[PDB]
């Protein structure tokens, strides 16, 4: 049936096209029908459109057969027919509705082409037309990217639609124009990017944070290859410029993801402006503990941008952050006691009784205790327990025990330019080989990303880089490599490449040289690449096959080419294919190591397709291991959305049913994939049940270690519970398993520490931080690295670590005690409102304190409001007209 | 012991305007699911591994025979004979064969017995009868604390009870206070008790068991207490775990002198539930959550401080909580600019979360009546008295 | 099987007859044309009974 009372619509808008010949009646009926359609679809919130539903059926024959109309006038009546036929587009026509757009609305523009459209709120030619020009235009770009003018007039039409989408309604539809910009212009996306930039930057300023968040979350999951990930990376750069507020430290973030492009984007994002450096631009430098070479390329060479050109550089290098860490430990926040290993190793009261002695000073447990004590008091100058008096304690191990005990002793004074040197001067003249190597490593360990102007490591180790002793070479090169983790200065290259190309050393030395050098640089450094390839050629097959150190050679090349896309990996795979089948392993390393955040299908598709399942019956060792371990490389933190179902991937598909020798230990991936401490998500089920399952030895040892992931500041409660439940009561008899249990589950006490690659903002990783990959391959090998004490320096190579604290200052010091709000993250930003990152207060700590990644803070009482809006542990409380 | 359960997929729920950020994230999830499917189909494509021992396993299977009945090991004797109860309820003094794991034999664990001449021939650690398997949550409910409006004190209390001991508990033994073993939510119907349980089951790291209370009662003699025992044994086995018993008053009513056999069995089932609640130490990582509307009708022994210390109150929402719930449920609606929603809240009534959800649904229905989807304020105006059915006027003024 | 207890066939899902009888297998003969008044009531029912089922998209 029908309404009856409003049965005029099924008549007049029915006969008017039915009667359609005479041109005056045609023009009159077309004009009247345009007026009716406008009056209906313009203001009436009713989604139903009376004429649209009543134009159907008859429209598909009348408005389609009257489409020619023979053009009695020049264009006017044809324009009227097109304006009519552009009304019943959605339902009346087929899925080639974009075809209706082409020959109705594209071929001609009724003066203002959106005369009956721009007035409509969202439906008639804004959402619908947007769909049409992101489907048809995308396909035409895919096949005929340079088409006729039907590719450019549609471009201006789409640009006008996009800008109107912000200024026709001024509503949350602002989350559509960039989105359209993404789907539209599939090949020439940059033109759409400039269009939306010139629109938004001049349109309105608070509607820019939505643009940044949209671009950020589309960056997290872009299309598969970095041809538009880079473009959308570059899109918000004008939106960061003076077109928005000037401070906007986001430039670093927005330059860190695009292959950490320092010398191409940093030159103008913050180096060009240099007008408000007295503001949080100074902490923008301070929150840039990734690319010290960037500060070298501007501050030291010029020294005239501002007075605080080099004092700022030194203080934000380590010295003032180290002093802040110390004072945070002592002066105001007092959890700085003397914490040795024994004070909590026997934290279980079962271990008191039934021991019947059981006190053995053997190398393994003494080594484990030294490692634990070194880790717990990391960057603490207060560990006067196993440092001065216990020199015989340094002695009560085997040969490698000397090395590792001295290494831990150095680790105690992490990045201590003065204290570390004045405490290693005593052990420098150790009068013993292994302790001497440990002292070299300790000299290189107080230089973790230090970038000291005096450069003590290079001169102090150049004597032993090539000296005729394998352990001297190992210690010196490891220490210097840990010293030059970020920068890739030519001096260390010219010093180490001859060592790297030397043939006196065994390939344990060659591999650690490769690790150190490839960890020095994160760019190209083709000399290192050439050395790696020639070494892979000049060595004989058994050496590169079964020496238990060949894995390190491709790792250096990968770490050199980490972050950068396949542009270099193509030629790397081309050149590496000419080697022994071990190169396959190298292949499955180097390629997959080139990406830090590259959440995509095809890369992991190959990882899971040709390298996972085409190897299940294959007995090629250590080939699947890197595959499944670096499945989480290029996936560590794509806003962590990619991490959960990856966890499902390995736990369900890999751990449960995988190869007992190449996939059963799919667990240090959990070490790298996600690490905060999460029951049934990262540790409890997936690691605990495998750890109790000591059926496979290497699985047990490795996943007992794997808690080193969550271990940075795990709030050891419910994690130390595991240790007490398995120390003595678990794998006590197994010497190696107990040793690694002690190491992992007892180096949790290290306070205010964080090893994860993801930075404080979270949208950018840390290539320097990602260099903690060598103690993943090496920790998986377990032969001559961990289970066998062939080389324990990798277990010290965890100088890819940042203080997990939160501290605030105002151009002077930490004296600001503004009330803070640290709590679980929630939905925010891109939704209807940027709701506070903390849903509530939780802990109301005002003093500077710990801030783990699953914790964020918000400023209080609108007092001394920070402008960083990133809170990279170095908040600056620049005041304003608070309480207006 | 084993580990917890209740695997869930990505939260997603960061965008909702369907702005292809949703599409990109969902496409990533779908790509990972595709790699799941392809990887396991390949692994089953090539996986030759079988036989090996064969002969010894074949002869042990011949010794076991076919079929093998499962029973409950009620008691043990000298380490060759035991007492095992068939599912019927009859238990026998049977022998124990050599190939059984003498360490695994404990009172309660299911034992595989020989069909003829009953004798313990195996141990099953995963009996988990279909009912109790059903009560274990597999797919986490889509609701979460974001969906809960107000009840901030209630959320705080429930997290301090069931989450803080699960996460870092050092505060508890540091103060020396034993963790709160069990929590009872209560309040008028449709305040959000079951919704809070759903949200807990979402943001969880432990095996969540949903129970109905009335589900526990079973027709056959001793089936009730046996099922309760099985539920709590599964809770301990998959500890840490949370056992949610909705509508506890289905059995929690005041205990009275039973007369008929059925009421005696109900008393037995509740006695077994109370005994199981007492059985595990509060230091254990298994917690219970019981929700009810008629709190006043519960037995005043179930809510003893020695059994259930906490008592979470779910009062009718306040005006600010009412507007919070309205904002939450109107998030997916395309409301117009004329709507204010303040008049409905300001009206002194007894709206609940369920009432507000129904008001939003009915407002949407009224808008659909007018062929629109923008939902005016008049739609809410009508819907409020549409769904709110049922002091003598000027007596109080 | 007989007493070997061997799974030899898969049968439809278990529904005991007490509820299996509650299907309306024989539809009744009562139309809205046989209902006087109640037009508003019929519409209100239909908005909950089959409108959600026929088209949940709205």
């Amino acid at each position: 049936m029908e309404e009856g009372g409003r049965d005029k619509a099924p008549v007049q808008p029915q006969q008017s096209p039915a009667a359609a010949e005479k041109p005056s009646g045609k023009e009159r009926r077309d004009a009247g029908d345009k007026d009716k359609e406008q009056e209906l679809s313009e203001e009436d919130k009713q989604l139903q459109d009376e004429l649209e539903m009543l134009v159907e059926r008859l429209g598909e024959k009348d408005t389609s057969l009257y489409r020619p109309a023979l053009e009695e006038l020049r264009r006017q009546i044809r324009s009227s027919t097109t304006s009519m036929t552009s009304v019943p587009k959605p339902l009346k026509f087929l899925r080639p509705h974009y075809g209706k757009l082409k020959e109705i609305y594209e071929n001609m523009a009724p003066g203002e082409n959106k005369r009956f459209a721009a007035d409509i709120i969202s439906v008639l030619a804004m959402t619908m037309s947007g769909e049409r020009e992101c489907l048809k235009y995308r396909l035409v770009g895919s096949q005929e990217e340079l088409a006729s003018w039907g590719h450019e007039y549609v471009r201006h039409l789409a640009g006008e639609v996009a800008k109107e989408w912000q200024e026709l309604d001024d509503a949350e539809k602002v989350q559509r124009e960039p989105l359209l910009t993404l789907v539209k212009e599939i090949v020439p996306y940059n033109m759409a990017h400039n269009a939306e930039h010139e629109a938004c930057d001049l349109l309105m300023e608070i509607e820019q944070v939505d643009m940044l968040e949209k671009d950020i979350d589309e960056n997290a999951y872009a299309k598969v290859c970095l041809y538009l990930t880079s473009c959308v990376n570059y899109v918000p750069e004008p939106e960061n410029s003076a077109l928005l507020r000037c401070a906007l430290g986001v430039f670093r973030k927005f330059s860190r993801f695009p292959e950490a492009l320092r010398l191409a984007l940093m030159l103008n994002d913050m180096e060009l402006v240099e007008d408000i450096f007295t503001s949080c631009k100074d902490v923008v430098v301070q929150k840039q503990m990734a690319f010290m070479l960037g500060r070298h390329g501007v501050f030291l060479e010029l020294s005239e941008d501002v007075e605080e050109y080099e004092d700022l550089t030194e203080i934000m290098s380590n010295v003032q952050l180290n002093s802040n860490f110390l004072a945070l430990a002592r002066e105001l926040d007092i959890m700085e006691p003397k914490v040795p290993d024994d004070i909590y190793k026997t934290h279980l009261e079962n271990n008191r009784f039934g021991g019947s002695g059981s006190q053995v000073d053997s190398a393994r447990m003494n080594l484990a205790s030294s490692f634990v004590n070194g880790f717990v008091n990391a960057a603490f100058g207060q560990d006067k327990l196993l440092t001065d008096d216990g020199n015989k304690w340094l002695y009560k191990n085997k040969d490698h025990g000397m090395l590792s005990a001295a290494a831990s002793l150095g680790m105690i004074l992490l990045w201590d330019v003065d204290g570390g040197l004045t405490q290693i001067d005593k052990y420098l003249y150790s009068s013993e080989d292994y302790i001497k190597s440990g002292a070299l490593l300790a000299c290189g360990i107080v230089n973790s990303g230090v970038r000291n102007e005096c450069d003590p490591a290079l001169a102090l180790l150049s004597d032993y880089v090539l000296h005729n002793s394998n352990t001297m070479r190992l210690g010196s090169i490891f220490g210097l490599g840990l010293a030059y983790a970020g920068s890739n200065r030519e001096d260390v290259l010219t010093l180490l490449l001859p060592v790297m190309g030397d043939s006196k050393s065994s390939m344990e030395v060659a591999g650690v040289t490769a690790l150190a050098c490839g960890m020095i640089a994160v760019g190209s450094c083709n000399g290192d690449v050439t050395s790696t390839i020639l070494q892979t050629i000049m060595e004989k097959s058994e050496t590169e096959l079964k020496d238990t150190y060949a894995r390190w050679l491709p790792l250096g090349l990968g770490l050199n080419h980490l972050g950068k896309g396949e542009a270099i990996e193509a030629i790397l795979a081309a050149l590496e294919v000419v080697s022994e089948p071990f190169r396959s392993f190298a292949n499955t390393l180097v390629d997959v190591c080139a990406y830090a955040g590259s959440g995509n299908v095809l890369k992991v598709q190959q990882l899971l397709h040709i390298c996972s399942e085409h190897f299940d019956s294959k007995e090629k060792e250590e080939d699947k291991d890197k595959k499944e371990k670096k499945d989480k490389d290029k996936k560590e933190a794509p806003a962590d959305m990619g991490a959960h179902q990856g966890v499902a991937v390995l736990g369900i598909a890999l751990i449960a049913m995988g190869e007992e020798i190449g996939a059963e230990m799919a667990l240090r991936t959990f070490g790298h994939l996600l690490r905060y401490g999460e029951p049934t998500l990262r540790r409890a089920v997936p690691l605990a049940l495998a750890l109790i399952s000591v059926s496979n030895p290497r699985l047990n040892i490795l996943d007992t270690l794997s808690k080193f992931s969550h271990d940075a500041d795990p709030e050891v409660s419910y994690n130390s519970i595991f240790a007490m439940g398995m120390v003595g009561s678990g794998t006590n008899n197994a010497r190696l398993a107990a040793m690694l249990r002690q190491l992992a589950q007892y180096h949790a006490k290290d306070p205010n520490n964080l090893f994860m690659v993801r930075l404080a903002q979270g949208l950018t990783h840390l290539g320097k931080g990602t260099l903690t990959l060598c103690p993943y391959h090496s920790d998986r090998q377990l032969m001559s690295q961990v289970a066998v004490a062939g080389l324990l320096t990798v277990l010290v190579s965890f100088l890819d670590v940042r203080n997990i604290i939160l501290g605030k200052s105002h151009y002077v010091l930490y004296g600001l005690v503004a009330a803070m709000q640290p709590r679980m993250l929630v939905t925010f930003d891109e939704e209807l409102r940027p709701l506070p990152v903390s849903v509530r207060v939780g802990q109301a700590v005002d003093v500077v304190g710990q801030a783990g990644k699953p914790k964020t803070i918000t400023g209080f009482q609108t007092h001394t409001t920070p402008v960083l809006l990133a809170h990279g542990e170095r908040a600056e409380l620049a005041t304003e007209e608070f309480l207006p | 012991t084993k580990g917890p359960d209740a695997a869930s997929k990505l939260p997603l729920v960061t965008p909702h305007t369907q702005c292809r950020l949703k599409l990109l994230k969902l496409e990533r999830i779908k790509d990972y699911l595709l790699m799941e499917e392809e990887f396991i189909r390949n692994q089953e494509q090539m996986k030759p591994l079988e036989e090996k021992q064969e002969e010894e396993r074949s002869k042990v299977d011949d010794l076991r025979g076919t079929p093998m009945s499962v029973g409950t090991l009620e008691e043990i004797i000298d380490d060759n004979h035991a007492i095992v109860s068939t599912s019927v309820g009859s238990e026998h003094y049977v022998s124990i064969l050599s190939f059984v794991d003498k360490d695994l034999l404990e009172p309660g664990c299911s034992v595989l017995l020989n069909h003829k001449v009953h004798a313990v021939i195996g141990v099953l650690m995963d009996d988990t009868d279909p009912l109790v398997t059903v009560m274990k949550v597999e797919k986490a409910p889509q609701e979460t604390y974001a969906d809960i409006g107000g009840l901030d004190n209630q959320i705080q209390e429930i997290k301090e009870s069931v989450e803080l001991p699960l996460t870092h508990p050092e505060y508890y033994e540091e103060m020396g206070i034993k963790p709160p073993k069990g929590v009872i939510l209560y309040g008028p119907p449709g305040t959000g008790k079951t919704l809070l349980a759903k949200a807990v089951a979402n943001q969880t790291s432990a095996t969540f068991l949903r129970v109905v209370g009335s589900e526990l009662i079973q027709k056959y003699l001793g089936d009730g207490p046996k099922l309760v025992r099985e539920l709590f044994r599964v809770a301990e086995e998959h500890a840490p775990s949370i056992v949610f018993i909705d509508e506890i008053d289905a059995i929690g009513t005041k205990r009275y002198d039973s007369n008929s056999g059925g009421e005696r069995e109900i008393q037995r089932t509740m006695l077994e539930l109370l005994n199981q609640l007492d059985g595990f130490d509060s230091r254990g990582d298994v917690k219970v959550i019981m929700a009810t509307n008629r709190i006043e009708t519960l037995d005043p022994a179930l809510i003893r401080p020695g059994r259930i210390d906490r008592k979470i109150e779910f009062p009718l929402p306040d005006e600010k909580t009412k507007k919070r719930i309205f904002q939450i449920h109107t998030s997916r609606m395309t409301l117009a600019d004329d709507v204010t929603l303040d008049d409905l809240i300001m009206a002194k009534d007894d709206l609940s979360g369920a009432d507000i959800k129904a008001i939003c649904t009915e407002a949407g229905l009224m808008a659909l009546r007018e062929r629109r989807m923008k939902v005016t304020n008049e739609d809410f105006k009508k819907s409020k008295e549409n769904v709110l059915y049922k002091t003598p006027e000027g007596l109080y003024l | 099987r007989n007493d070997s207890y061997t799974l030899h066939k898969i049968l439809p899902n278990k529904v005991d007859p007490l509820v299996s009888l509650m299907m309306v297998e024989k539809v009744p003969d009562s139309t809205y044309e046989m209902i006087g008044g109640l037009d508003k009531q019929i519409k209100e029912i239909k908005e909950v009974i089959e409108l959600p089922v026929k088209h949940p998209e709205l």
């Binding site: 309404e3 989604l47 139903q48 459109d49 649209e52 539903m53 159907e56 959605p90 339902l91 969202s122 439906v123 959402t127 619908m128 947007g130 769909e131 992101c134 | 305007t17 369907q18 702005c19 292809r20 949703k22 599409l23 969902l26 496409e27 779908k30 395309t334 659909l368 009546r369 062929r371 989807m373 | 037009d39 508003k40 519409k43 239909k46 409108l51 026929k54 088209h55 998209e57 709205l58």
Partner: peptide, 30 residues
């Protein structure tokens, strides 16, 4: 006032017009 039950054309137009352009793709993907 007697309210009109939605007709077939009404239902068909309701599912379209006032829809997000990505309705089909998102629902299908889910």
């Amino acid at each position: 006032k007697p309210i009109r039950a939605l007709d077939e054309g009404d239902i068909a137009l309701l599912k379209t017009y006032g829809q997000s352009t990505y309705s089909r793709q998102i629902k299908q993907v889910e």
